[PDB]
């Protein structure tokens, strides 16, 4: 026995946390109130037939928190773990990092500290947020360094909604993205991808949902986190811990930004049309378009590859499929990283939702790597930042939060050094 | 939560605010008296932003009515939905500045500043958290501009952190309704560069031509102008008032629209706008709107952005569609309008969607954009001011209210610096 | 228990006391005759404070009616609730001082002092324990002020330990109803600095303006003034009359309001005060009252506290709310009104709540505060007295009643010392 803590900041973070808790509740049979020992990794035993999520819901705006506390799962969540803000940063990293974040970071730090107090087997921290959101950038970053300074070497996992190259809710998104990336770089143990446009494209072409909604995105995150945490929440042939995830993909602290991909995303009518075998599902998932990242991995080199099989998957078939994956030349690896393969097998089949886009299947695989194509996105973001900051636009907004342009500039050069480190 | 207090100045401003209030009563399911009858919880969940907690299951608008004459006062109160306002919010003068900025700002504004500050402070304190303000007035008029300037000054010195927007009505270049209206615009802009965080410029002749041609009406009226104004109204404020997959507020727009403190003038937008025998034949799809987002026909403040360059664009949507279509449409808009767009502000389209469409339309789209086209308007205003100030005509009315020469000189210098900065951006 | 005897002087005082008595009959469930019909035990549990044990299941007010003329006598007795008073409490003169202090205090007061002392002693002895007294009169009037001075002197020499309050009516500065009213105010205050433990100053024009503007009445009358007076009435005395989570009495207020024996003048307060078409639209919450606690509009005794400094504030509440909201509201009131407040009296807000709200209102709030604003009123009175005493005009009427020069000199010297001490506090 062991536990983990999930952190949700901003609208995207709150929605993601709610969806993930919906998964964890329906997978273990939790009714909306909390009733009917691996489920203790995310829920706490007190009283009689009771469980509550080990999470904190915080946002500078109370709209999403109000929406959460109006669902049928009010009884499921403790009221005190929901935090309501008053002044949304409005896509401003500095606003949510200094003006409102500094006076509300205390209660959250403080009581996630108790969440660790009753969880002596705290494996790590889960963070869900968005770069585009000013709250989800600033408050998330500051609480990230607060976690680092209050826990030391404790493992921490970040799930960030990176704005897409052509999808941006706010035009000031480069400022928030660059600022948060420079601020939390040294402490970000592992940060993933989310490309909204790639999610929409995959849903429209794979699930063939011409009119999807953010619920599809919500379980897109939900299924990813479920596949990641199945090892901790269910036994398997070779379970994988959170520590090994950062051990394999962080030989150097500078590069800790791996991309994620799921296989498969198939509707029930199309699930009738295809049953999964290891070779086909892996080679489909390794296909660049199947990746939920809008960056072709074949442009650069591959760091490492991690497989997360769940269900009735034969390890020998895994080895054979992975080998025949290796031999083909569409896949290339760095010279000094010949053997960077880790496989995690779990016996728990992926869980379905009623009325969901995904189809109920006994087996699945999670696609886990850090390709060099992320450098393309980083360079494009840096170029956009240079263009839109060259005339110094929207800077006065961050100035009114009380800093001058210097920190913007050296964050730009820090991220440039990160980009050229490849 | 995030309460917004409405203050209306001038006859046009009072009419605009009233029409807004009936439109909000439609959108939130409020009858002519104040009772709620909406069929969905979404209308009444965030009713407190524009309404207050009234006894007997009622709601009253968070509005402040200011004028120097009670003529439009009586017409508005005796008009539709006049009983939804308490008599206390109606405070009026008895002299009238007579389309004079100095009179309405110093002579008659001296005995109205106390009342307007008292009522706005009462509205601010009686609410939970005042997110910001919204003011409507006409820069062509003299009194309304003076009330706008006085209120923005008092708000800035009282609530320097609470942002707002001013929906001022710039006089039409084609028609000189008032001889001394250049002074009014001069002083109003000189105070706006200084006491307002962001401003939308609403020009008459552009909406007149839209009603004439786009709507295909042979008899345009103030009613249609107030209707489109209320559509702009709802389009900007629906993200805060109504739940959305991409939630937004006035603070988000202000952050996304203001690159420099003095560069805060933007030109609002609305679409689609089609008649009965075109709507049943037009495509009710996004491309029909994206061809309508960028055009000099459905264009708001009479200065063509094609001559200048767009600073950045904000687009709010209300309906049932996916988001990626919007993103690719914005990308195509950049791809084809690159020359009309600015090269050094990549992805300058601000994308957000409110889930709830307005009453009677399953889409509405509000185009919030900024371009250096307003440079032409400001330069023409400056040269007109120079033209009839070189002759020193009609200065006696202002100098009789405690005016001075070099004051107007630094006013015109401020607009000169503003237009020079806008040209430098161009 | 803690019985209070009411004595009314002058026509205005008699009307005020009567209106009080009907209001108490409402609050305690007493009909026009005296029978009890209240629906709760709380009304009739402490009825003995203002009523006496009457046979046949009846109750009569503990009131004393004094006048020098029977005109208002007959109107009051023949008016509503006139049968609830025994004929013995009505004692009247037959001459009338004619708005003269000296006449009503020496000439006609000589044959009324015996009667008033006899009746007040009968009321005191017939009761269990007389907690204190309450008197109503007008300082503008001559006779009423003389009766007030005589009664406070006799009470002080007879019951020096039993505190009271006097609800005197200071003449309005704007209107000179009586030419010799400055003498009346002079002598009344000279006796009040000396025979009264604490005094509330009630000024006409302030309540007149409140009825005109705050209540929005085009025809203010004495009835509304007496109504608001009876609200002040109930607001002060509800803590003693009715059970409360924070029980209080007149002794608590006197201890909390009097820092120096000569510094005992305070300016009462009432809220909320809203009309039919504002009450159904206003917020029936505490903040709507706390914005109404501190204002020159709903303000009682015509001198602005903003110019001066508050000494200390007492706030009594009647309704259904928690107490911490009141405490934090008082803290915010300090935080924002620190300049208007006194720095060397920290936490100068006296907080108490009576559980039972008045009839017809689920909150009423009575603002008992003290400020150095009354310094302006006293200084203006002193300078007026100097102005028309330098000319020695209208002195013959007073000197014919046994008056003298340096007596008025030490009177004006006493007000000079009082105003100097108040300025020193400021
Ligand atoms: N993938 C995904 N992203 C979402 C979802 N909801 C919101 N987002 C992200 O949120 C961004 C919009 O801004 P928010 O993060 O909501 O900003 P906010 O919550 O208002 O916080 P502030 O900007 O500080 O006021 C978008 O760019 C999205 O990337 C969702 O359901 N799915
Ligand atoms: N769109 C629109 N414009 C209006 C409306 N009413 C007046 N206007 C415009 O406003 C301008 C006059 O502004 P106005 O507010 O009337 O000046 P004013 O200073 O307040 O006039 P006064 O009170 O001193 S007499 C005119 O050019 C007119 O076209 C209206 O209802 N809708
Ligand atoms: N609020 C209020 N004020 C009143 C009322 N009646 C009289 N007054 C005020 O009291 C003042 C006169 O005081 P008053 O008591 O009538 O003098 P008086 O000395 O008793 O008059 P007299 O008996 O010698 S003839 C006037 O200024 C008047 O405004 C009343 O019913 N309500």
Author numbering:
A (entry chain D): 1 to 36, 47 to 432
B (entry chain I), C (entry chain H): 1 to 44, 47 to 360, 369 to 436
Sentences reproduced from the published study:
Microtubules (MTs) are important components of the cytoskeleton networks in eukaryotic cells, responsible for cell shape determination, intracellular transport, cytoplasmic organization and cell division. A pf is formed by head-to-tail stacking of αβ-tubulin heterodimers. The GTP bound to α-tubulin is buried in the α-, β-tubulin intra-dimer interface and is non-exchangeable and non-hydrolysable, whereas the nucleotide bound to β-tubulin is exposed to solvent and exchangeable. A tubulin heterodimer with GTP-bound to β-tubulin is termed as GTP-tubulin, while that with GDP bound to β-tubulin is termed as GDP-tubulin.
In an attempt to study the early MT assembly process using fruit fly tubulin endogenously purified from Drosophila S2 cells, we have found a similar intermediate structure in the presence of another GTP-nonhydrolyzable analog GTPγS. Notably, unlike the “GMPCPP-Tube” made of bovine tubulin, the S2-GTPγS-tubulin assembly intermediate can form under physiological Mg2+ concentrations, thus closer to the native MT assembly state. To improve the quality of the helical order and distinguish the α- and β-tubulin, we have incubated the S2-GTPγS-tubulin with kinesin-1’s motor domain (KMD) in the condition for GTPγS-Tube assembly and have got a more ordered helical assembly decorated with KMD on each tubulin heterodimer. Such kind of sample has enabled us to solve the cryo-EM structure of S2-GTPγS-Tube at 6.8 Å resolution. The 3D reconstruction of GTPγS-Tube-KMD is of good enough quality to reveal important interactions among tubulin dimers in the helical assembly, which consists two layers of tubulin-KMD complex, the outer tubulin and KMD forming the first layer and the inner tubulin and KMD forming the second layer. In the Tube, two different types of lateral interaction interfaces are observed between neighboring curved protofilaments spiraling around the helical axis. One interface is the same as that in the MT lattice, the “MT-bond” interface, whereas the other interface is unique in the Tube lattice, therefore named as the “Tube-bond” interface. The “Tube-bond” is mainly sustained with the interaction among the M-loop, H10-S9 loop, H9-S8 loop, H3, H4, H6, H9 and H10 helices. Our Cryo-EM structure of the S2-GTPγS-Tube demonstrates that the tubulin heterodimer adopts a curvature of ~6°, between the initial curvature of ~12° in solution (before assembly) and the final curvature of ~0° in MT (after assembly). Comparing the tubulin heterodimer structure in solution and in the Tube lattice, we have found that one side of the “MT-bond” brings a half curvature change and a rotation of intermediate domain, where the M loop changes from unstructured state to an ordered helix.
